[model samples]
Target chain A: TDTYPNIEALENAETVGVAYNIEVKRQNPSMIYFSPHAGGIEVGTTELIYRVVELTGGSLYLFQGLLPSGNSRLHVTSTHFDEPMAVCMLSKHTDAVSFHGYKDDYNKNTLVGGLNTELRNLIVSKLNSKGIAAEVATDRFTATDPDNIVNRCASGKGVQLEISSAQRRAFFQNNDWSKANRGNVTQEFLDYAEAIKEAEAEYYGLE
Target chain B: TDTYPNIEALENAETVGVAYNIEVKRQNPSMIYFSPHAGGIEVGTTELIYRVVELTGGSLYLFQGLLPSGNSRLHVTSTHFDEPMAVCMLSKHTDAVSFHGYKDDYNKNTLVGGLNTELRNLIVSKLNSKGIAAEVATDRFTATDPDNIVNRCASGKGVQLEISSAQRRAFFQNNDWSKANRGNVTQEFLDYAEAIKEAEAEYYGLE
Candidate 1:
């Protein structure tokens, strides 16, 4: 838990490279908030939710940030997409879009994250090969932040993987969620660097 | 305004012809909801927030009352379609569907209301012919609702019409907003009643 600010100090010092999103478990006598601190790194991370097109546990989707296109009354965004997207990640002339019901819980012990489907599906295959089931993903990943998937990646989007109890049990050695040892750390704790390159190959594999 | 209770009283009194649903404005110090009381009227209303093919708003959508064909979820419902709905008298559905983005104020003398496109365009033609410029309808009407479009109506799926702010001003005479006198009473109100009938002919008229 104290590792949060220490990690931030290292990233800020440039001694390491990282995107530090910290969630502090909060309380008000009635409710325990299992989300991120407001207005911080975790601000823009997408939280999984149901959207108009993709909300089922199985179907995947792509969102440009969280807002729907053409309308921006809600917490989504400010741009009105008049020109079709050239997807920094997927097929040109993106034919469709993405799903949603999410709250502003930025960090939970059960962290489930998402990205656009084109980028998302490629990684799903990778995880399965590594014996990870990783089931939670949705069109919504954040409500409080503007910088998020498909929007924040080299492409318009990418993935944010969060572990549910199931994925936690499957990927970690002791299911020890108490330290760096608490994680299935390794290429796993590496958090989407090299994994991104490999998955790129899979994306255009058909081509 | 006073007509609120009178009509429901009439219906319950068995003294009139209408299924009326009323929305009472609710509030807390932190929030002033122009919407109906929570867990009440506004819940079932329909506006095409979710496109037709997209009505399960999310895969997790569980509308308390509905039909997912003959095999969807919860209950197949225990109601009928012949019942004419009692409305909140315009403030804000579908086909054969509806549209609205409401400002949070009511009883603004502008009195602008919303309506759905289908019922709206139908009435649009008539209001223009009557020498009154009726603004198009998109988000206000009965079926007291939006969801009622897919749930209520003769086919169990039908359209609803309500006045827009423009219509309230255009069709009604004094703008008392109190009397049917506030409305386009007599031939004015009569036009809509007969108009509804006239259009029902037109709806099947295309046949």
Candidate 2:
């Protein structure tokens, strides 16, 4: 909840200086539900990034307006900082996370909301076979236009992950992400990061 | 990002004393990501909840287990809390906060895993009609099989809201829910609570 480790990972990666925007809305005192606004107003925040992303499209929401007045280099999220409740996007793992054996029709868009079927399948296959119970779902993350985050990646179509809390909890040492935890690392977390890297590698590298 | 208003709304409700088990793992020294794990422990600080629940579930992970925990009264989620960037269930209300216009077919569950359809639609309709460019969608919260928090409600179904940052911004005064801003109640929040109340009444109350 304090520090989004992936950003740390991304920053540590060769892709850190790569062509993409990576945005992370940490739990700060000034953020509300969706800071920066739909109009792309930069408020009590600083720092910017670019990364390969995937988002769905409908009416002009966060991402749509973002591109208009934005830097041509970065992608991530803008969210609501509600009282205590921070429903995070787990698919953000850049991979997929679902129940081990659970598969339904709606379970299709496992790659967040901005990837193709093949890409989604590839991601799901990797995670699913690994026992994460994950999948690629196309729900709220699917972007309509082609210029969305996931596609804007150097690879031209990134993986979209949205893991749930249960699945994600598996990644934590003691289910703690506090300052005192000082960022407790877990095998699940490492595995997850590895999983995403693999997905990104196979898709972006191979595709 | 500091306060949660739905729990406030729920605390004020007549069912405050109900047998429902409301829980929230606060931003303390123990939170690594998701909690209530291993020892089934209660690490760190304190919290409470109900009514217009602002579950982290909008991101779609813990809610899967929370709903079926037999406590039948809780939720989880938000955006990118860890390695996998889960696009989230997009059904959190106090609640809400995501990246795209994502509308998944499998996500047809919308916030239903934690909320009901009528209520979600009501909130969406109210916001959409206001030119908010928002609508009710089922991207993850569709757990009617009894494990979902939605069905776990006393009414056997609860109303889940997953507004965009913009929609939630509308709920705050001047679009600010920052700690410095504290609980600057917004018209949207009141209306949202009221709408959920009506839904709860119809769905759970006087049932």
Q: RMSD, each candidate, Å? A: 21.8, 22.7
Q: List-wise, what DockQ does each model earn?
A: 0.01, 0.01
Model 2 RMSD in angstroms: 22.7
Give per-residue CA lDDT, model 2, range B1-207, as digits (tens): 312223333223312113122222222110011221101111010110121333211111121111122321322222212221221221221222111112232221113223445545654555444444444444553434443333333344444433333444444477663334425666655554444334433433332
Q: What docking grade does candidate 1 earn? A: incorrect
Candidate 2 accuracy as lDDT = 0.31
Q: Which tens-of-lDDT digit does each residue in B1-207 have in candidate 1? A: 222233224223321101222111101111111211111112211211122213221111112111212111211111221112212101111123222122322431111222234444565565456544445433443343434423232223433333343333333356333333432333454443344444434654664
Runs of candidate 2 exceeding 4 Å displacement:
A1-111, A154-156, B1-207
Q: CA shift at B19, candidate 2, in angstroms?
A: 63
The all-Cα superposition gives candidate 1 an RMSD in Å to the true structure of 21.8
Question: Per-residue lDDT for A29-89 in model 1, tens only?
Answer: 1111121211121221222211111221111222221211211112222122111111221
DockQ of 2: 0.01
